[PDB]
Amino acid sequence: KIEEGKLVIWINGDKGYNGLAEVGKKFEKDTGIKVTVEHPDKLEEKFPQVAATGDGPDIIFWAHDRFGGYAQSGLLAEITPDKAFQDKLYPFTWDAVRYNGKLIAYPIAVEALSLIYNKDLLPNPPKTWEEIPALDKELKAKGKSALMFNLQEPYFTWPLIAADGGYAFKYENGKYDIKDVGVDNAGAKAGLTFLVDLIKNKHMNADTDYSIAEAAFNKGETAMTINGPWAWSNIDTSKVNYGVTVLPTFKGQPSKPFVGVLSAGINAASPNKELAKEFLENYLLTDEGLEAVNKDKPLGAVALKSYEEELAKDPRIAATMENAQKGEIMPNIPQMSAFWYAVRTAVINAASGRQTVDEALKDAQT
Amino acid sequence: SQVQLVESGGGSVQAGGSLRLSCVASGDIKYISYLGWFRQAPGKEREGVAALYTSTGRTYYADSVKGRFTVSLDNAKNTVYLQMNSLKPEDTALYYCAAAEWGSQSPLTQWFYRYWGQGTQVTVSA
């Protein structure tokens, strides 16, 4: 069904697909193999729907977390990089593409939340969460606030909640134990208590969402926000003199943002698996290949050590990678749906006072 | 505090690999006689890993790391190192440097030490 002797690649419409096409042209110049890059509409649902019939692209680019279910469904081939190639990418990026003990995709890029700060209001951003109440009192005396970030999504509140011991699902030796959830342990209680205390003491507002925090930071009303690299363009347009840095620690431990790894999987139905391996290892996952994609639309931080060392000369990218290495790889299992829903309810109920922290997290654990 | 300790060198490492941590001691450090490395997983106890008695160079290791890790001091740099070989997933933790002029209990117990760094994270992939 898939045509032998060429490569078809699918990547989402928010990525550098024209730069990826340039890598395809370089591959063709060396091999004669035509590489066609498409950015299909509705790609998230389209790939599993078409691949389940033995059709679709040779290579699919998507965040690693969806690849667990695709691998379970038999849609992805096991990849076969040798040790020398594996050593060219950061070890934790390979963790994100393991399923059932097997490598099922090549890591490309790495994304995580960072602390974003206004250098004019706050030249020396805090290293600890514990400093934030006193900092907010200082800034409130000048008609500003220390920190505003989206409290509505567990993706944003989890880094603090889980810092001193929380976790979604226990991961040991390449497998998630869906019976070992770390939502109501002492560490998660401590982090959510700190978060709720910030609200109780009026250092944060329970209603702050993505829109409210983005507007406040970009208008210079708050000294800090927490957001990802997708938000930087709007801050550029706002002309705020901003920096991006490591998330604050809690009880000395790193905040643990969820990590998303843009990854390239090989369709199990491809008759071009060896060409796909050659393209991804020897053309895309090189300084020149990633530069071509990044020049079209920035990748953020990347899994390839050599090119990450170049990109990290931008301290914002260095910060993204630092927060990612310290964070929790997003689990690639469908039980994450239950996790998001349970933690969302817990934070709503604790932040509004309908439940205590202990009651809220106990319900989310069960 | 006119003794400051600053750790560096943490990051992502593959099991079986090696990593060297550094800790720079600044300030009035002439009376420091013990330098320790500790590690702490989130929500867990801060446990002694290795310690160096600088007067004679004697070293102490936790059973779990003895033979794999090496603590050493470069006096011409006021910098103490933890060379970590044959790394295991069980080695993942925040690693702290600590210092003391003297102490009355075990040099592998956290309560022995007066000065503490900020930690550097070591995460070992299986």
Author numbering:
A (entry chain A): 1 to 366
B (entry chain B): 0 to 125
Show the paper's wording.
At the core of our technology are highly stable synthetic scaffolds called sybodies, which are designed to mimic the natural shape diversity of camelid nanobodies, thus allowing for an optimal surface complementarity to the limited hydrophilic epitopes on membrane proteins. In order to mimic the surface complementarity repertoire of the camelid immune system and its capacity to efficiently target membrane proteins, we designed three sybody libraries based on prototypical camelid nanobody structures representing these three binding modes. Hence, our convex sybody library is currently the only synthetic nanobody library with a long CDR3 that mimics loop tethering as found in camelid nanobodies. MBP was chosen as a simple test case to validate our sybody libraries, because it is very stable and was previously used to validate synthetic binder libraries.
Crystal structures of three convex MBP binders (Sb_MBP#1–3) in complex with MBP were solved at resolutions ranging from 1.4 to 1.9 Å. Sb_MBP#1–3 have binding affinities ranging from 24 to 500 nM as determined by surface plasmon resonance (SPR). They bind into the cleft between the two lobes of MBP and thereby trap the target in its ligand-free conformation. In support of this notion, SPR measurements revealed decreasing sybody binding affinities at increasing maltose concentrations. A Schild plot analysis revealed 58-fold decreased sybody binding affinity at saturating maltose concentration and an affinity of 1.0 µM of MBP for maltose, which is in close agreement with the literature. An analysis of the binding interface highlighted CDR3 residues W101, Q104, S105 and W110, which are identical among the three binders. Further contacts are mediated by variable randomized residues of CDR1, CDR2 and CDR3 as well as several invariant framework residues. In summary, the crystallized sybodies bind to MBP in an analogous fashion as camelid nanobodies, namely via interactions predominantly mediated by CDR3 residues. In contrast, the structures of our convex sybody/MBP complexes revealed binding via the designed convex surfaces into a cleft of the target protein, thus confirming the anticipated binding mode. X-ray structures of three closely related convex sybodies in complex with MBP proved the integrity of the sybody scaffold as well as the utility of the randomized binding surface.
